[PDB]
Amino acid sequence: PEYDYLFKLLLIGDSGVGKSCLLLRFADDTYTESYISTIGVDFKIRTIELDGKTIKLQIWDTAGQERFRTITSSYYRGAHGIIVVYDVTDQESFNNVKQWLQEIDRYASENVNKLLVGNKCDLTTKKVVDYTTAKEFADSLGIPFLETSAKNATNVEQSFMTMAAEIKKRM
Amino acid sequence: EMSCAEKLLKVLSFGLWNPTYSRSERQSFQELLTVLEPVYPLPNELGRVSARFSDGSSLRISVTNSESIEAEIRTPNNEKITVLLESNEQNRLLQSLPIDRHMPYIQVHRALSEMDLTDTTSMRNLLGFTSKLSTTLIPHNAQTDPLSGPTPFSSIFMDTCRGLGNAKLSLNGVDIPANAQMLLRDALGLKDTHSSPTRNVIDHGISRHDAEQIARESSGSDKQKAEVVEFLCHPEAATAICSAFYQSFNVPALTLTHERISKASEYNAERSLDTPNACINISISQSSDGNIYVTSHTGVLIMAPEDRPNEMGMLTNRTSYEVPQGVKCTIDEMVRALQPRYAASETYLQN
Numbered sequence: 001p002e003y004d005y006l007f008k009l010l011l012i013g014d015s016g017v018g019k020s021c022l023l024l025r026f027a028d029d030t031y032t033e034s035y036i037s038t039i040g041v042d043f044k045i046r047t048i049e050l051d052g053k054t055i056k057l058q059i060w061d062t063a064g065q066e067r068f069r070t071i072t073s074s075y076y077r078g079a080h081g082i083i084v085v086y087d088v089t090d091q092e093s094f095n096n097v098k099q100w101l102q103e104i105d106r107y108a109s110e111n112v113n114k115l116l117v118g119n120k121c122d123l124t125t126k127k128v129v130d131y132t133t134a135k136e137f138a139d140s141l142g143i144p145f146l147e148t149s150a151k152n153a154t155n156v157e158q159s160f161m162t163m164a165a166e167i168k169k170r171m
Numbered sequence: 172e173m174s175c176a177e178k179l180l181k182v183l184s185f186g187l188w189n190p191t192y193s194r195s196e197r198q199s200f201q202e203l204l205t206v207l208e209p210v211y212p213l214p215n216e217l218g219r220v221s222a223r224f225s226d227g228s229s230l231r232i233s234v235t236n237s238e239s240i241e242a243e244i245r246t247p248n249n250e251k252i253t254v255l256l257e258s259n260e261q262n263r264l265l266q267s268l269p270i271d272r273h274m275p276y277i278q279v280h281r282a283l284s285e286m287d288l289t290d291t292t293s294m295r296n297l298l299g300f301t302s303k304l305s306t307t308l309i310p311h312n313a314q315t316d317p318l319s320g321p322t323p324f325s326s327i328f329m330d331t332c333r334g335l336g337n338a339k340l341s342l343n344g345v346d347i348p349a350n351a352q353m354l355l356r357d358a359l360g361l362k363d364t365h366s367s368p369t370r371n372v373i374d375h376g377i378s379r380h381d382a383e384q385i386a387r388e389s390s391g392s393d394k395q396k397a398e399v400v401e402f403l404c405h406p407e408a409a410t411a412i413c414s415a416f417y418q419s420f421n422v423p424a425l426t427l428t429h430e431r432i433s434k435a436s437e438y439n440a441e442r443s444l445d446t447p448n449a450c451i452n453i454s455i456s457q458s459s460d461g462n463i464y465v466t467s468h469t470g471v472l473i474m475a476p477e478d479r480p481n482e483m484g485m486l487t488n489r490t491s492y493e494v495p496q497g498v499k500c501t502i503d504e505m506v507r508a509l510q511p512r513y514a515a516s517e518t519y520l521q522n
């Protein structure tokens with residue numbers, strides 16, 4: 001075509017953990033604080049090269065506040081992969097990963113790809129979720145995991161490529 | 172010779188979308204029409220609207236629940252004329268006021284100029300227009316109710332941080348620009364996205380000095396500026412501001428429409444059009460009785476039903492509510508005091 005592969009990605013997680021920030025960093029290599037919140041669902045496209053193959057990613061960026069969940073869930077079953085984000089400075093956000101994974105269990109395709117991302121890892125002072133606490137949890141579910149900083153670009157690119165490769169492998 | 176309040180009142184009666192108006196006249200009207208702000212309605216009023224122009228003339232329109240319309244002109248020489256207005260099909264008067272109606276169908280407007288949705292400024296401007304036109308009210312049930320569920324309002328402070336400096340915001344008709352909104356951001360104690368407002372503001376409101384600084388940086392009349400300072404010094408002014416940004420106000424309306432909104436998001440992301448996801452336009456007024464009314468708008472791009480395919484317009488959600496006295500800026504306190512009323516409209520570029 002004009003792309004070798006077409007993958008659909010979903011960002012999922014509590015409000016304000018940084019899902020839009022991560023997406024805008026991956027799609028435009030910018031970080032700004034001059035955007036209103038995500039109302040409903042946002043959408044960005046980016047192409048990557050992997051194993052020489054051109055891959056077109058279609059990333060849906062959901063709103064994470066509770067009331068939005070029912071609208072949000074309608075987008076799961078389309079996705080090739082779902083990224084669950086939490087804020088590493090915010091304990092309650094990590095605690096909620098369990099439910100989000102239940103949402104994936106309830107709504108997404110039975111063998112969708114799951115990645116876990118711990119954002120705002122540049123705020124080291126206020127950091128409350130340690131790598132080992134998260135890794136071990138992710139390990140227990142066969143889920144890949146990275147800490148990232150949309151602000152510093154730290155592991156943002158790596159995240160999506162890992163997700164991509166993981167889907168690629170699956171087909 | 173003829174005042175602003177009067178000019179506009181001629182227009183609304185002849186009709187905003189009347190075909191006999193040259194395009195250069197339509198722009199000169201949208202300039203007059205944007206002075207219109209919603210305000211606290213009295214007990215029998217379906218909605219009340221107010222405009223205070225720079226030529227010193229004001230205008231107060233009120234629509235009763237029986238949909239009867241009454242305007243009041245105040246000339247720059249303080250004369251008090253009172254007109255009875257009739258809305259019908261050639262004027263669409265009722266449609267060109269910021270009022271929530273009980274229609275059997277969501278209202279559909281046509282943009283008055285070439286607001287071709289390419290970028291941010293296009294979108295904001297269109298929302299600038301739609302914020303002043305009518306909307307159809309939408310009921311919610313327990314599941315789509317923004318205030319129901321296990322954690323209502325949990326996101327307002329985050330929403331407030333992201334919104335301030337990125338919204339179009341008016342208090343008592345005074346436009347508070349980005350710089351000022353950013354001072355107000357810091358004035359609430361919401362310096363960083365992870366904080367709550369200070370125990371001092373929650374209790375006593377913004378400090379007098381902060382308020383005066385914000386009102387100096389703002390565009391608007393000198394008398395009006397003073398009302399803004401007095402508004403900001405209230406514990407309830409913090410409540411009004413923060414709540415107006417609540418993201419889930421938009422849930423009743425999207426429930427009816429999101430698939431079409433997403434369609435527009437994709438359509439645009441494919442053409443590399445750098446169009447924001449959502450725009451916010453807030454309008455808050457304190458009556459000369461102390462009554463605080465919030466009217467909060469969210470505009471969002473939307474695709475026409477599959478009857479006029481590939482046509483794109485804007486979906487506008489209006490949230491109106493009173494902030495009663497003594498309702499301090501707290502999530503727990505907002506959830507039990509505030510009683511929002513959600514409403515929407517679809518606007519498409521006549522193009």
Ligand SMILES: Nc1nc2c(ncn2[C@@H]2O[C@H](COP(=O)(O)OP(=O)(O)O)[C@@H](O)[C@H]2O)c(=O)[nH]1
Binds near residue numbers: 064120122151333
């Ligand atoms: N320091 C830091 N702040 C971040 C980072 N990512 C997001 N934030 C902050 O969190 C706020 C909300 O992020 P946002 O993307 O809107 O969260 P969302 O609700 O999932 O879209 C932003 O205004 C940023 O200031 C990060 O990697 N580092």
Ligand SMILES: [Mg+2]
Binds near residue numbers: 019020062
């Ligand atoms: Mg977002």
